[PDB]
Design a protein. Structure first.
Lengths: 230, 50, 50
């Protein structure tokens, strides 16, 4: 004699905000599904982010291209916060060519079908000389969690080039997930709760898709208890 | 006596880790004891962890 | 006799002489780690009596 909650309306406040509600919760299950969902979404959602950059005429990170007005150490720290969602493949290799005076925004990346940038007003660097020219070949991958450049070196496998500037990659499309259970009301039931997961992605992952991939990470894991093998 | 010298530089980039020694301005030292995950940290009413 | 900065080294595997060019010095930008070679240098030694 239990109740089971069903997905309800998804108020989309902005592009990076979201509010999804789980209507018919039995009493005592508010904080049980919430904190078991907030603790999964913040941890293990698969995403995509840059993995290694490569510029045309620079050898290491601490150089300084001529014409741009940032050290290369800042051009990598600006790419790391580049949000991008690839649909078909698993990894891509982007491109970026620009010349002339004016800030090189992220929207000047070469346009492919699958690769779909999300924040096209993103600044990357600046150009401040009429005969300046910056041409890089960004890389992109899928994964989850966080894997720094040092620990991703163990699987280097003879990284022959000396122009492969390595970036640290933090794939995760969530930044903060608050949730609060309140007094839901079915037509006739003394006490029913409502979960309201106020999520906030970096414009990458669909909200309703996150929960349907956070639940199957739980429901796939409880098998080891349902069948206590001994 | 010396014939030819060769000086070489290395630019190592060390991160933070257990064992380091942070400290505020008011003389409150402390050695970092652990680096939690993103979600074990106490979150206030709007999810922002400390 | 004088030492040399020749890029040839006695019984060293080619895994070690990968970064340094034929002149003996390392490149500029080659990410090295512990125990790698930075400057090939050999010193004359006789008087073995093994």
């Amino acid at each position: 004699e239990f109740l089971k909650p069903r997905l309800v309306d998804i108020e989309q406040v902005s592009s990076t905000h979201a509010k999804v509600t789980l209507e018919p919760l039995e009493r005592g299950f508010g904080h049980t599904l919430g904190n078991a969902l907030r603790r999964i979404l913040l941890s293990s959602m698969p995403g995509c982010a840059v993995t290694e950059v490569e510029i045309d005429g620079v050898l290491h990170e601490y150089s300084t291209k001529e014409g741009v007005q940032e050290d290369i150490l800042e051009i990598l720290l600006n790419l790391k916060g580049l949000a991008v969602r690839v649909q078909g493949k698993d990894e891509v290799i982007l491109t970026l060519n620009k010349s002339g005076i004016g800030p090189v925004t992220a929207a000047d990346i070469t346009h492919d079908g699958d690769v779909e940038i999300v924040k096209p007003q993103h600044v990357i660097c600046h150009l401040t000389d009429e005969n300046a020219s910056i041409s890089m070949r960004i890389k992109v991958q899928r994964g989850r969690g966080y894997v720094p450049a040092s620990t991703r070196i163990h699987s280097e496998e003879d990284e022959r080039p000396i122009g492969r500037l390595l970036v640290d990659a933090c794939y995760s499309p969530v930044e903060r997930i608050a949730y609060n259970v309140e007094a839901a009301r079915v037509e006739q039931r003394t006490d029913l709760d409502k979960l309201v997961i106020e999520m906030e992605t970096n414009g990458t992952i669909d909200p309703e898709e996150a929960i349907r991939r956070a639940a199957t990470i739980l429901a796939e894991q409880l098998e080891a208890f349902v069948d206590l093998r001994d | 006596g010396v014939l030819k010298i060769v000086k070489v530089y290395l630019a190592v980039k060390r991160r933070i880790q257990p064992g380091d020694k942070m400290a505020g301005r008011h003389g409150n030292k402390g050695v970092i004891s652990k680096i939690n995950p993103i979600e074990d940290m106490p979150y206030d009413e709007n999810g922002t962890p400390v | 006799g004088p030492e040399e900065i020749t890029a040839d080294i006695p019984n060293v595997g080619e895994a070690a002489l990968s970064k340094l060019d034929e002149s003996g010095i390392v490149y500029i930008g080659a990410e090295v780690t512990g125990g790698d070679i930075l400057v090939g240098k050999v010193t004359p030694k006789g008087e073995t009596q093994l």
